[PDB]
Amino acid sequence: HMEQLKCCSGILKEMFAKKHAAYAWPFYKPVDVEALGLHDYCDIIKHPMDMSTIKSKLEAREYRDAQEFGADVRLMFSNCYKYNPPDHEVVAMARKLQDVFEMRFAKM
Ligand X SMILES: Cn1cc(-c2cc(NS(C)(=O)=O)ccc2Oc2ccccc2)c2cc[nH]c2c1=O
Residues contributing to the site for ligand X (CB under 6 A): 26-27, 29, 31-32, 36, 38, 80, 83-84, 89-90, 93
Q: Shortest approach of ligand X to residue 96 CB, angstroms?
A: 11
Q: How far is the CB of 62 from ligand X (least distance, A)?
A: 21
CB of 30 closer than 8 Å to CB of 47: no
How many other CB atoms are found less than 10 A from the CB of residue 6? 11
Rounded to the nearest whole angstrom, what is the least distance from the CB of residue 35 to ligand X in the complex?
A: 7
Distance CA 71, CA 77 (A): 10
| Nearest approach, Cβ of residue 94 and ligand X (Å) | 7
* Residue 9 to residue 59: CA distance in whole angstroms: 9
Cβ proximity to ligand X, 3 vs 37, nearer residue:
37
- Measured from the CB atom, the residue of 3 and 40 that comes closer to ligand X is 40
Residue 3 vs 87, nearer CB to ligand X: 87
CA distances from 1 to 4, 11, 62, 104 (A): 5, 15, 12, 17
Closer to ligand X at the Cβ: 32 or 65?
32
**What's the CA gap between 73 and 51, in Å, rounded?**
8
